[PDB]
Ligand binder design. Structure first.
Ligand SMILES: Cc1cc2nc3c(=O)[nH]c(=O)nc-3n(C[C@H](O)[C@@H](O)[C@H](O)COP(=O)(O)OP(=O)(O)OC[C@H]3O[C@@H](n4cnc5c(N)ncnc54)[C@H](O)[C@@H]3O)c2cc1C
Ligand SMILES: Cc1cc2nc3c(=O)[nH]c(=O)nc-3n(C[C@H](O)[C@@H](O)[C@H](O)COP(=O)(O)OP(=O)(O)OC[C@H]3O[C@@H](n4cnc5c(N)ncnc54)[C@H](O)[C@@H]3O)c2cc1C
Ligand SMILES: Cc1cc2nc3c(=O)[nH]c(=O)nc-3n(C[C@H](O)[C@@H](O)[C@H](O)COP(=O)(O)OP(=O)(O)OC[C@H]3O[C@@H](n4cnc5c(N)ncnc54)[C@H](O)[C@@H]3O)c2cc1C
Ligand SMILES: Oc1ccccc1-c1ccccc1
Ligand SMILES: Oc1ccccc1-c1ccccc1
Ligand SMILES: Oc1ccccc1-c1ccccc1
Lengths: 554, 559, 559
C-alpha cells in the first residue's frame, strides 16, 4: 500500500482529519481496529467550535437535524432521584439569558447534544465521500520512520493478513492508550460505570435539563428525549434495580441496555509531534468528562493540522509549518486536562453544605432533607450554602465559555502585528473575549449577503486563506493577488462595505475589527487570524508578502 | 343614572380602568363619544409592563395570540426606499442578544406589536364581561362637584337625549384634548407639528428575510400592521387623494406590487404634561395628562399603567377599607411619569437630524442630492470611511426611541404615602437609568421578576402577586410573617396573601434566583401592592420587623 | 332615533347582520338588553360555512388565532371518568383521515373550536368599526309597523329613559324567546328538558396524549374551553353549591388536581322551528327561528348563515337596486334550514341510549351496576365479544352529532326567486346527504371550493367571490361574458365582477380542478351571489346563453 497520510484511528479526531485532508485533495488512509463506529453515546456535548468546523465543511445542518438543541439542555436538576424532591437547579449549557447572550454573540453556532454514537458515522462517511480511504477491522502494529517517510505494519482482522503501508506522515488519532504516541516517544505530564437503558421518562422531564444528577453521585443523562437513557456514576439484572432507585419509582418499564466502564489516567502530552508523527485527540489529552471538552478539542486538533499538512504535501509550505501544530495545540492539551480535573472539586462542597460525609446512608440523606427545610436562621444559612455550592458546579456544565473559545496561538504560523497582548477584561475561563489580534480566532459578527445574514466565519475557511477589509482598503485586492501568484497560494479577498458582495449591514464588523476600515485581517483555513494590518498604507501593504512567506516557512 | 365611577373615555386608559374596577367589584360607567373603538392602528408597541398587566388580569394569552412577537420586530431598516438600497439596520425592540437578555431578565413578559385597532376591543369587551357598564355614542358635556360626589351631564348620540349621572368619582380618560382635565383646571407644562398616516394593503418578498417592525425612508416610516399584507406609511389638516398611491409607490421604490390605498388620517400633537393629575373627585389619566411624540411607544403603555395605579386605590376607598387620602398617591406616583415620557419622547426626535448631517445632507434633500450622498457613502477613501462611520454612529443613536429605552419603560420609582420607606437610602442606578432597567426591592420599586417553581413548573414572582390584593413574600425562616399578616388582615379588614417561598413549599426558589434578587435575608419580607409595586420591606422576622407591618399597612391605607 | 335596520339582538346572528349591513353601507342600530357579550362559552364548534363567512369579511385569520384547531378536537373519549378507564374513542370532528379528506376538499376553511365568549366580541367590535351603531343595555319592548317602515319602543337600562326608533326594517335576532317573533306572529312547529353547565379551572396530564374537544362520562360531558386549563362540565332551575366541586371531582375521577369552581348556569330548550321567518318588515333569524339541542353544533353556525343570507338582500332593496320581493327569498331559503337543524339536532339524541343498552345498563345505572358492566366488557367469552362489538357499534353511531354530519352542514339547496333555475333536474345525492357533502354547481347550491392560483399562490374559488357583490366565473372561451356582464351591470345599476379563469389570466386553473368541478364547458358561466350561492348557470357562451344573463339578474332582483 501507499498513501500520503496514514491516520490511525477513526474516532472524532481521526475522522475529522480524514475528512479535511480528503477535501484539500490529500490522499489518506484512515484505519480503525474495530468493526464499527463507537457503540456508546460517550461524549455528547458539541460546542460552538466543533459546530463552526461542521459549518465550514457543510455538515452543520445535518448535525443540527440529529442533535438535541440548546434549549432542551438547560434545565439541570440536582435531586435524590428523578421522581423525588430536588435540591435545586442550575442553568446548564449557557441557558441563563445572560449566558445565552454571551453564547449567541460569540459564534454563529450553538451548543447541541449529539452523542458520538451518531457524530462518528456522520464524519466517517463524509471522509470516504470526499476521497479518504477508510478501512476498519485493521490494526496498527508499529512503524519505522526514515526521513523520506514512514512504513507502518498493519494487521487485517478480516483476512488475517499483515501488510505494510508507506506514508509521508502518520496521524496518531488512536485514543487514550495510543500506541502511536508510545512509538513516537511523546512525554506525558500531569473511572466510571455507564448503563444504557430505555424508559419513557417524558412525564418527569417534559415540564428539560440535559442531565439529572442524583446525590455517591449518579448522573441520569438524556440520550434521546426522553426515551433513551444512560446512568453514570463514580453488574447483572441488579442494574435494573439501580435504575429503579435512581428513578425513584419502579413504575416505568425499563429496558436495560449495554453496560460499560470508562477508566481515565489523566495526562497530557507535553509535545504532540515527533518527526513525521503527529498525535491528536485522546492520544495527547486524557481527562474527566467535566465541561465536555474532549471530543470538541480533539476535532479542533484535526482542524489545526490538516490544512498545514496539505500545504506542505503540496510543496506550498516548508515542512516547518508543521512545527506550529505542537506550538498551538499542546498548550490546549494541558489546559483542558487541568480544567476538566479542577471541575471535580466543585462537587464535595455540595455534600458539605448538606453537612454530609462523602458517602451518606439513606438515613443520613433523609436527615439532610429535613435540615434543609428547617425554619431556623441556621436552616437559611444551610439553604444559601447549598445554592452557593450548586452554582459553583456550573464551570463544568456550560459555564466555561472562556475555556471553550479563548484560544491564543503563539507560533511561526501566526505573524505578530507588534501590539501587546491586551489580556482579558473578565475571567478568561468563564468568559469569551473576542480579539482580532493575530493568534486569536476570527470574531463572529453578522454581515449580509443579498440582505440575508452571513457570518464573518462564512466568508472564510474552506481550506484557504482569506483577507478581510473594507472599501478604503481596496488596495488589498491587488496586493493579495501579487502575493498569491508569487507564492502559489490561494488568497481570497473580501471587501466588506455598502454596495459590495458582503455588507456591514449592522455596523458590527467596523465595531469588532479593532482597526480602521482600510486595515486587513488575514484568516487561516482554521479560522485563526494570522496577520493584521492597521491600514492600507504602503508599509502596511508591503508587510503582507512578508507575513505570508513567514507563515509558510519560506 | 348612578354609578361609583364615571370613566370618560374608552381608549386604553379608560378601558383598562373599567376592567380593573369591575374585577374589583366596583360599579362603573364607561362612556365614549364615538360609535366604535379606534379605527386606526395607532399605538402598536406593547411593552413588558402592559403585558404584565394583561398577564395579571388574564388577557396576556389572547394578546399574544393576536400580536406579532418580538422576534419579528427587530429589523429596523434605514433606506432610500423599500426595494432600494439600505443605509443600514438597527437591532430595534431589544433584538440585540445583549438587549434581549436584559429584556428577558426584567419580566416574564415580552415586547409585542399589537395595534390599538385590536387591543382596544379586547379590553372594552373584558370590562363589560367583568361587570362594567359600557356606553358608546355618549358624550361627556360637563360636571359639577359637591362634597359627596359628582354630577355629570351627558349627551346621547343615539337618542338625542341629554341626561345626568351621579358618581362618587370621575376618571378623565378622554384623551389629548381632555375636557375633563379642562374642567378640573389641571395645569399643564412643557408646551415646548403633526404627522399623516396612510393605510394601504400590499403583499410586500422584501420584508421577510429581515422581519422588522418598521422601515424608515430618508423621513417616511413604513410600519407593520400585519406581516406583511397590511401596511401604513407615516411622515412629518392636509388632504391628499390618489397620489397617496403614488406616495406609497416611491416609498416602496417600485410600482409592481398591487396596493390598496386605505384610510388617510392626520395626528397633531401639542406636547404637554399635566403637572397635577387630580382635582377633588376628578382623576385624569392617559393622553389626558401626557401628550407626546410616538418615539419610544410610551403612550399607550404609560396610559394603561396610569389605570393600573389608580383602580385598586379607588376600590379600597369606595369599600371604606382605605381613607380617601390613599388617592393622593395617584398624583404623587404618576405625575412624575407623565412629565418623564413627554420629555423623553421629545428628546428622541433630536436623534434623527445627525443622520442627515452624517450624509452631508440638508433637512430637505432633493433626489439628486440624495443620490449623491449614496455615491459619497461608497467612496473608497479615508474620507469615505469617516462618512460611513459617522452614518453608523448617527443610526445607532436612534435606538433610544426604538427599544433602547428599557430603563425608561421599567424604572418607576414611587415616593408617596402609598409607599412605606424602609429607611435605606436610594441606591440609584449603576448604569444609565434610561437605557437600562435596574431591579430593586426597595419600597417604591416594581417587584422584580425571577422564576420560581410551582409543582416544578416555572412561575414568576409576579404571578404570586397582583389580583387586586396585597401580597407578602418571604422564606421558610420568615414563617412568623404568616400569623402577623393574618392579624393585620383581620384587624384592618384587608386581604393579604402570604407566600412562603422555599423547599417543600407551594412555591419553591428552584433556581435560587429569589434569594439572589430579594436584597434581604430569607426571613425578610416584601409587601407587594395590587399594582405590583413594593410598598414595604422588612430585613428580617425580628419582633421589631414583625410589628412594623401593621404600621406600614395602616399608613398606606391612610388609617 | 332613526335608522335603516333595527337589529334586535347582538348574539352571533345580530352581530353578523350588523357587520355585513355596515360593510354594505347600510345604516343599522344593533341593540342588546344586557351589559356585555355572552359570559359563557356556550356554542363553540365553528363549522366551515361560518369560517368561510369570516374569511369573506376578513376575520378568519383572527378567528383562527384564538380558536383551537381541528387537529386538537378529534379525540372524543367515552369513559367512566377522566382518570378512569375508557370504553373507547371516536374520531370526532372529521378527524378520521377519510373524513378529513372530505372536509378539506369541501372548503378552504376548517373546523375549529371558538367559544362564543370570544366569537361574540370579535364580531360586535367589527360591526361597530364597519359603521354600525351598537347599543347595549337597551331593551326592545315592542313595535308597530305601517306601510313605510317600523317604529320600535326601547328601554334604556342606563338612563331609565324610554325612546322610539324609526326603521325601514327590523331584524329579530333576539334569541330563543324572541319577543320580535312573538310580535310578528311567526308560527312555530315541531314542539315535540334542560342542561346544567359548570365552569371550572384545572390543569388536566390526562387530556394531552389525546387532544380532544370533549370527554363523555357515563351522561356527563367534560368539554374544552382552553387546552387544557379552562373547563366546563355539562349534563342533562337547579341550584348546586360546593358539591359541584365534588361533582367535578368524580367526573375527573380523582381529587388531586386543584380545581377552581367557576360560574354555574342552566340552559333549557323548547325545541321548535318557525315555519315562516318573515312577517311584513320583520325578519327573524338565529335562535329566534330555530331552537334545538346542541348535538352537531349547528346553532351558532346556522344563525350566522341566516344573517349572511339576508344582509346583501336588504342592502340591495334599501339601495333601490332590488325590488322588495327579493326579501321573500329569505324565508324560502332559510326556513327549510331551520326545520332541518331542529329535527337533526333532536334525532342525534336517540343515538346515546343504545350505548347504555349495549352495556346491559338501565338509563340510570348505580356505581355497582356500572362497575359490573365494565367487568362484563372484559369477559373472555364469545358473549363478551358480542358485547364489545355492540358497544363499538353504539359508540360509532354517535358520530352523526359529533362531526359526522358534514352533509347537514354544507348541502344547502335553495329554491326561490333569488335562484334562477337552469332547466336541469335535481341530480340528488349519490351518498347519504346528511353524512356526506356533495358539491354542485347547479343554481341554488353553494359555489364549490377548489384551488386556483393567483401569481402561482393558491386561492379558493370562494376568494374570487363574495365581498357584498355578484361574481361571474368563466374561462378563456367564455370571454364574451365580460361584455355581457358589463351591459347588464350598467343597465341594472348593479356591480358584477367577471373572473376569466385560465392560462395567462389573473386567476389560473393551475390544478385543473375548476374544469373538473364546474360541471360545464369552459365557455359556461356561474353567477355567484354575495352569499356564495350560485344563482345562475349557463352551459356555454352561445347567443342564447349570453342573453339569458340579463333575464336571470332581473329575475333575481325582482325587476
Ligand atoms: C468508553 C468511553 C466513554 C467515554 N464517555 C465520555 C462521556 O461520557 N463524556 C465525555 O465528554 N467524553 C467521554 N469519552 C471521551 C470521548 O469519547 C472523547 O475524548 C473522544 O472520543 C476522543 O477522540 P479520539 O477521536 O481522540 O479518541 P477515540 O474516539 O477513542 O478514537 C480512537 C480510535 O482509534 C482506534 N484505535 C486505537 N488503537 C488502534 C490501533 N492500534 N490500530 C487501529 N486503530 C486503533 C480506536 O478503535 C478508535 O477508533 C469516552 C471515551 C471512551 C473510550
Ligand atoms: C390618529 C392617531 C394616531 C396615533 N399614532 C400613534 C403611534 O403611531 N404610536 C404611538 O405610540 N401613539 C400613537 N397615538 C396616540 C395613542 O393612541 C395613545 O396615546 C393612547 O390611545 C391614549 O390613550 P387614552 O386611552 O389616554 O386616549 P384615547 O385612546 O384617545 O381615548 C380617549 C377616549 O375618550 C373619548 N372621548 C374624548 N372626549 C370625550 C367626551 N367629551 N365624551 C366621551 N368620550 C370622549 C374618545 O373618543 C376616546 O374613546 C395616535 C393617536 C391618534 C389619534
Ligand atoms: C346558557 C347557554 C348555553 C348554550 N350552550 C350551547 C352549546 O353547548 N352548544 C351549542 O351548539 N349551542 C349552545 N347554546 C345556544 C347558542 O348560544 C346559539 O344558539 C346562538 O347563540 C343563538 O344565536 P342568536 O345569535 O340566534 O341568539 P343569542 O346568542 O341568544 O342572541 C340573542 C340576543 O338578543 C338579546 N335580546 C333578547 N331579547 C332582547 C330584547 N327584548 N331587547 C334587546 N335585546 C334582546 C340577547 O341579550 C342577545 O344579545 C347555548 C345557549 C345558552 C343560553
Ligand atoms: O456528560 C457530561 C457532560 C458535561 C459535563 C459532565 C458530564 C459528566 C460527568 C460525569 C459523569 C457523567 C457526565
Ligand atoms: O410607531 C413608532 C414606534 C416607536 C418609535 C417611533 C414610531 C414612529 C414615530 C414617527 C412616525 C411613525 C412611527
Ligand atoms: O357541545 C357539543 C358539541 C357537539 C355535540 C354535542 C355537544 C354537547 C351536547 C350536550 C351536552 C354538552 C355538549
Amino acid at each position: 500500500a501507499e498513501t500520503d497520510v496514514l491516520i490511525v484511528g477513526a474516532g472524532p479526531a481521526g475522522a475529522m482529519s480524514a475528512t479535511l485532508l480528503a477535501s484539500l485533495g490529500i490522499r489518506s488512509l484512515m484505519i480503525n481496529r474495530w468493526r464499527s463506529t463507537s457503540p456508546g453515546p460517550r461524549s455528547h456535548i458539541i460546542n460552538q467550535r466543533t459546530m463552526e468546523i461542521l459549518r465550514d465543511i457543510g455538515l452543520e445542518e445535518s448535525a443540527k437535524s440529529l442533535a438535541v438543541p440548546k434549549e432542551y439542555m438547560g434545565e439541570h436538576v440536582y435531586a435524590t432521584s428523578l421522581a423525588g424532591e430536588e435540591f435545586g437547579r442550575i442553568p446548564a449549557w449557557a441557558s441563563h439569558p445572560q449566558a445565552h447572550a454571551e453564547h449567541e454573540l460569540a459564534s454563529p453556532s450553538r451548543y447541541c447534544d449529539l452523542p458520538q454514537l451518531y457524530f462518528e458515522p456522520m464524519v466517517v462517511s463524509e471522509a470516504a465521500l470526499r476521497g479518504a480511504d477508510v478501512r476498519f477491522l485493521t490494526e496498527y502494529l508499529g512503524h519505522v520512520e526514515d526521513q523520506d517517510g514512514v512504513t507502518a505494519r498493519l494487521l487485517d482482522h478480516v483476512s488475517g493478513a499483515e501488510y505494510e503501508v508507506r506514508a509521508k506522515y502518520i496521524i496518531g488519532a488512536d485514543g487514550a492508550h495510543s500506541l502511536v504516541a508510545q512509538n513516537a516517544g511523546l512525554p506525558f505530564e500531569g473511572g466510571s460505570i455507564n448503563i444504557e437503558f430505555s424508559a419513557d421518562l417524558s412525564s418527569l422531564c417534559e415540564h428539560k435539563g440535559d442531565m439529572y444528577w442524583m446525590f455517591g453521585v449518579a448522573a441520569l443523562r438524556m440520550i434521546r428525549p426522553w426515551n433513551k437513557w444512560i446512568c453514570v456514576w463514580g453488574t447483572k439484572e441488579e442494574a435494573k434495580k439501580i435504575i429503579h432507585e435512581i428513578i425513584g419509582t419502579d413504575e416505568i418499564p425499563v429496558e436495560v441496555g449495554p453496560i460499560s466502564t470508562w477508566t481515565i489516567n489523566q495526562q497530557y502530552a507535553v509535545r504532540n509531534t515527533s518527526g513525521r508523527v503527529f498525535c491528536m485527540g485522546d492520544a495527547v489529552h486524557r481527562h474527566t468528562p467535566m465541561g465536555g471538552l474532549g471530543l470538541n478539542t480533539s476535532v479542533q486538533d484535526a482542524y489545526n493540522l490538516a490544512w498545514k499538512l496539505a500545504l506542505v504535501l503540496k510543496g506550498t509550505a516548508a515542512p516547518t509549518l508543521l512545527d506550529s501544530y505542537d506550538a498551538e495545540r499542546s498548550p490546549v492539551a494541558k489546559q483542558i486536562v487541568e480544567r476538566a480535573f479542577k471541575s471535580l472539586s466543585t462537587f464535595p462542597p455540595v455534600f458539605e453544605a448538606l453537612s454530609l460525609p462523602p458517602a451518606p446512608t439513606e438515613s443520613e440523606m433523609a436527615e439532610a432533607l429535613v435540615r434543609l427545610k428547617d425554619a431556623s436562621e441556621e436552616g437559611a444559612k444551610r439553604r444559601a450554602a447549598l445554592r452557593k455550592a450548586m452554582d459553583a458546579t456550573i464551570i463544568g456544565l456550560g459555564g466555561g465559555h472562556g475555556v471553550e473559545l479563548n484560544q491564543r496561538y503563539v507560533s511561526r504560523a501566526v505573524f505578530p502585528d507588534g501590539t501587546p497582548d491586551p489580556g482579558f477584561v473578565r475571567d478568561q475561563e468563564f468568559f469569551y473575549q473576542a480579539s482580532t489580534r493575530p493568534g486569536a480566532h476570527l470574531p463572529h459578527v453578522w454581515l449580509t449577503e443579498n440582505q440575508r445574514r452571513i457570518s464573518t466565519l462564512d466568508l472564510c475557511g474552506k481550506g484557504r486563506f482569506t483577507l478581510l477589509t473594507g472599501l478604503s482598503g481596496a488596495a488589498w485586492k491587488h496586493e493579495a493577488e501579487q502575493v498569491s501568484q508569487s507564492l502559489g497560494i490561494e488568497l481570497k479577498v473580501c471587501v466588506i462595505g455598502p454596495g459590495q458582495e458582503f455588507v456591514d449591514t449592522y455596523g458590527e464588523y467596523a465595531k469588532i475589527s479593532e482597526i480602521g476600515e482600510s486595515g486587513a485581517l488575514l484568516v487561516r483555513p482554521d479560522m485563526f487570524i494570522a496577520f493584521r494590518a492597521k491600514d492600507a498604507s504602503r508599509e502596511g501593504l508591503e508587510q503582507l508578502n512578508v507575513a505570508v512567506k513567514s507563515i509558510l516557512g519560506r
